[PDB]
Design an enzyme around this catalytic site. Structure first.
Site, mmCIF file in Angstrom:
data_model
loop_
_atom_site.group_PDB
_atom_site.id
_atom_site.type_symbol
_atom_site.label_atom_id
_atom_site.label_comp_id
_atom_site.label_asym_id
_atom_site.label_seq_id
_atom_site.Cartn_x
_atom_site.Cartn_y
_atom_site.Cartn_z
ATOM 1 N N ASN A 1 -0.005 -2.356 -7.020
ATOM 2 C CA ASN A 1 0.576 -3.257 -6.472
ATOM 3 C C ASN A 1 0.903 -4.497 -6.803
ATOM 4 O O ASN A 1 0.779 -5.027 -8.214
ATOM 5 C CB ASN A 1 -0.265 -4.486 -5.148
ATOM 6 C CG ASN A 1 0.637 -5.226 -4.498
ATOM 7 O OD1 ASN A 1 0.027 -6.745 -4.804
ATOM 8 N ND2 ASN A 1 1.060 -4.530 -3.910
ATOM 9 N N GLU B 1 -4.899 7.502 -2.284
ATOM 10 C CA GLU B 1 -3.158 6.286 -2.668
ATOM 11 C C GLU B 1 -2.166 7.192 -2.321
ATOM 12 O O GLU B 1 -1.407 6.797 -1.779
ATOM 13 C CB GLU B 1 -3.616 5.564 -3.514
ATOM 14 C CG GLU B 1 -4.769 4.775 -3.810
ATOM 15 C CD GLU B 1 -5.441 3.557 -2.535
ATOM 16 O OE1 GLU B 1 -3.895 3.564 -2.352
ATOM 17 O OE2 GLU B 1 -5.853 2.731 -2.526
ATOM 18 N N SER C 1 5.477 -7.313 -1.753
ATOM 19 C CA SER C 1 4.610 -6.798 -2.326
ATOM 20 C C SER C 1 4.791 -5.089 -2.122
ATOM 21 O O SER C 1 5.086 -4.773 -0.870
ATOM 22 C CB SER C 1 3.390 -7.111 -2.496
ATOM 23 O OG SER C 1 2.806 -5.967 -1.890
ATOM 24 N N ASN D 1 4.547 -2.838 0.812
ATOM 25 C CA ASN D 1 2.849 -4.065 2.150
ATOM 26 C C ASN D 1 4.622 -5.071 3.246
ATOM 27 O O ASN D 1 5.506 -4.832 2.956
ATOM 28 C CB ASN D 1 2.504 -4.496 1.108
ATOM 29 C CG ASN D 1 1.728 -3.289 0.227
ATOM 30 O OD1 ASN D 1 1.079 -2.534 0.660
ATOM 31 N ND2 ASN D 1 1.834 -3.513 -0.964
ATOM 32 N N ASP E 1 3.531 -1.457 -3.366
ATOM 33 C CA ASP E 1 2.076 -0.522 -4.525
ATOM 34 C C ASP E 1 3.080 0.291 -5.108
ATOM 35 O O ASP E 1 3.826 1.869 -4.628
ATOM 36 C CB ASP E 1 1.254 0.528 -3.226
ATOM 37 C CG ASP E 1 0.649 -1.224 -2.500
ATOM 38 O OD1 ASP E 1 0.188 -1.879 -3.232
ATOM 39 O OD2 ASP E 1 -0.185 -0.476 -1.942
ATOM 40 N N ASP F 1 3.120 -8.254 3.535
ATOM 41 C CA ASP F 1 3.671 -9.258 2.859
ATOM 42 C C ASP F 1 4.804 -9.589 1.658
ATOM 43 O O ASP F 1 5.262 -10.352 0.852
ATOM 44 C CB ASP F 1 1.981 -9.503 1.567
ATOM 45 C CG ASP F 1 1.957 -9.076 1.004
ATOM 46 O OD1 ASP F 1 2.539 -7.979 0.254
ATOM 47 O OD2 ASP F 1 1.199 -9.301 -0.134
#
Length: 129
Positions: free
Chosen positions: A59, A35, A50, A46, A52, A48
């Site tokens: 997220n 990660e 959002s 991301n 992380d 969309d």
């Protein structure tokens, strides 16, 4: 902070992540490796909108507030910035909520794709724990 492999294993264990919801410490270390490469300050945007955050790339759509993710929630009741701290407490506490959500560690797509089913004990091999 960029953790060493065994250094992170130990911090995760100290914070009660070892065998949490049945996931051995190596699973958690493996997930953190892919990660964030063990970097608490990791962020990734991301498609969309959002973002992380942190060692486990938690997220903003569900888990933390960053003020710029429309229609999202903040189920861990924290600013996303708390997930970037050198102190992993916020990330660990939030990860415990996430892994309890229903799908276990599958919530972390990188865990499912790169850790699940593999010899995850190798991630804590050699470590003083």
């Amino acid at each position: 902070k960029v953790f060493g492999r065994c250094e992170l294993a130990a911090a995760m264990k100290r914070h009660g992540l070892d065998n949490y919801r049945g996931y051995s410490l190596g699973n958690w270390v493996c997930a953190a490796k892919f990660e964030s490469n063990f970097n608490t300050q990791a962020t990734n945007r991301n498609t969309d909108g959002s973002t992380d955050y942190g060692i486990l790339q938690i997220n903003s759509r569900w888990w933390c507030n960053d003020g710029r993710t429309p229609g999202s929630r903040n189920l861990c009741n924290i600013p996303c910035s708390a997930l970037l701290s050198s102190d992993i407490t916020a990330s660990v506490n939030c990860a415990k909520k996430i892994v309890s959500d229903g799908n276990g560690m599958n919530a972390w797509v990188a865990w499912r794709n790169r850790c699940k089913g593999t010899d995850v004990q190798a991630w804590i091999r050699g470590c003083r724990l």
